[model samples]
Target: AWTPLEPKLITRLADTVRTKGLRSPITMAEVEALMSSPLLPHDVTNLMRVILGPAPYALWMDAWGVQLQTVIAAATRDPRHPANGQGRGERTNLNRLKGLADGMVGNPQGQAALLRPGELVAITASALQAFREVARLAEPWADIMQGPSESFVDFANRLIKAVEGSDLPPSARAPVIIDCFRQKSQPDIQQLIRTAPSTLTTPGEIIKYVLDRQKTA
Candidate 1:
């Protein structure tokens, strides 16, 4: 929910619109907004998982009750009658925070590890405290990245290895590799992208296309 619309995803979507040709509402402006966005990967993954539906959820308010007592202590110091009220308030502030660290006294459990709908999402006030368990498993995938020293082709090969291995698909399987230059076959690639469920139909087709269309060649 908290990620910029990635170029890859946007381009994938643009493929659908490409079939519509110029009449499509998916336009450069939409791409512009996506390119201009500022969100982290975890945010995007969270959203993607949510949209995928029947995602996991957790509950945490039960863990916050102990800290509530500290706030209660600070609030109870309402009477100016106790000369030590201010000190108690300050001390209570620390204790309450520590209470939070210690967690709710009862160690209660909220709904967790359940796969369900959006409305059933954690509605509790201390929402941040919840999902305490999700990050351990899901956070790593949120921040996918291309290797630092690799060129697109090199990286693509690795990506393909992980995605397809030795066997290649009937349809081409290459992503946009040349971001820095305009290619002669850009239109055709765009055309292919527009209608295909995927951007590739044949492995060699894309590889050959990219190689043949290189600006120098």
Candidate 2:
């Protein structure tokens, strides 16, 4: 016969069972009963589902391989790892990266379908943002080991300044410059506003003159 268990007691028991390598596979009926019981909080069942549902799916299908790859990448990137000092254990790193690539590449068609064209473009832009952050975070260490570039704080400030000072409509600037470069044609006045340096700078003056000529074409 089944007995009613207090939610807190059940949670504690579940943790103990897991720690002892024992199984506590509760049934859907048990979950439903707990959810409807006056003793349990309304949110408890939803919380349980959120936590448990993903675990089973990940275990059954190995769908969390990308996450595992990320973990491996982080471990390999840690400077204090014994093998990391000499860049040894790179094979393990490469294997993890390959696993990630294989998982993603195998579902390229599905992945492509999941995002719209504009959404894909936005994803690419988001990746650039992530790259910028990583570069910013790495810059100080890189400068110490190699040479310093502008910090993330400086890069962000420069981006803000470019946007505030540019005469072109914000929406048009990026696309216009992209199109101009793609077509091997000169970008016009607004592009110059962002790219041109302050007055009397030789390179800035040259670029400004070029842009002025392009605007007339």
Candidate 3:
């Protein structure tokens, strides 16, 4: 699932924000409720828009800050990226949200200028559309190693998730997964991936060979 909280509930919350005209601050009750709820990735973009749309800079930061914290609390449950659950995991999510917050309202130009308040939110939605895509790409997918005690199958699965989540090209995907495997796996396993039969072209195929060898040996 893309969000830890239910999609229907998030949709309703967004609708409430619209109906109320976004003039009032989101209540502490609402914040606590959302904090206790499940994950929210894509749905947060629109909810953030509803909350921040008509607000001034200070208010925008306030509303966004609360929501950002809410997003962080629940993002660990995002199923697609196990990176979210590791130590320092929330840093990735924070940076992603900060990227969204900064890109929307901060730094008008590359150097030092700031966006006119009017210009804020013009592109915020678009920037956040990329949130899920870039949020987890803190490193090259191929360079992410297996976690301690993680099995080949599990690491391979997570590697593929990172590969697919970052939208790596099909041409490079298998190689990246294989290369990652080589770095963390034992010498014999590394050799298996390197010298597998000609038919073992895909990551799945090569990984299967390594795991199969692991079982028999």
Candidate 4:
């Protein structure tokens, strides 16, 4: 069932894999949504090989041994990642991201490593299936992600109680908190969009120039 893959397609896939300080396999999985945006479902299946194979393969290898939360943070902040798509308009969900990354991390990348012709369809199918499982397990904080009518620091501490109680390594707490804050708070991200007015810009506007840019994307 492997469809014909294209060099140009592979090239476009490669371009998106360039992280530039940012976002993961889930990002690669999401590329499928973009590529297939204009295609019918039946037309998209063949294209799935391109989506699941090289792009995610490269991203997974790029992320190997990286902190789990780092991957989660970047995946959501991707340049073209849909801000309000299927993700419940909550930006990026940590639990949901963990599931998506988890689904694609194993044998799938291994298969892509070989670049074998026969496994093309198999890896794509397996990778997509795993991504599905990811969503199934964690629907954006199904049991968690609750009410938090407190100060930012207070609410932040509450959300991070897991790392505190479990004594997870720095690997767990900091980046996830930091990134989720970047998403949930959309605070001044140095120079990214959806951020608070830079102290630089705040003097110019309410929060600054950043406040003027909060339109949809």
Measured by lDDT, the strongest candidate is 3
Against the hidden reference, what TM-scores do the models get? Answer: 0.19, 0.19, 0.37, 0.23
RMSD of each: 18.5, 22.0, 17.6, 18.3
Which scores better on lDDT, 2 or 3? 3
lDDT of 2 by residue, 61-129 (tens): 232244334545655566453223345633234222222233333344433333233323322332223
Model 2 steric clash pairs: 143-147
Off by over 4 Å in 1: 1-149, 165-200
Q: In candidate 3, which residue ranges exceed 4 Å CA deviation?
A: 1-8, 11-46, 50-143, 146-149, 166-171
Ranking by lDDT: 3, 4, 2, 1
- Measured on C-alpha atoms, candidate 4 has an lDDT of 0.39
Residue 135, model 1: lDDT of 22
Error of 2 at 121 (Å): 0.9
Superposed Cα RMSD, model 4: 18.3
lDDT of 3 by residue, 1-217 (tens): 1223556766776566556533223432353355443223233444455443443324444545555565556555553332243455333445444434444333323211222221223123323323222222212575667665667778777777777656677677667666667776656566766776665656777776777777442
**lDDT by residue for model 4 over 9-53, one digit each (tens)?**
655654554432113445546455444423222223334344445
Model 1: clashing residue pairs?
A: 1-47, 2-43, 15-194, 170-201, 171-201, 171-202, 172-201, 172-202
Shift in Å, residue 195, candidate 4:
29
- Model 2 lowest lDDT segment of ten: 138-147
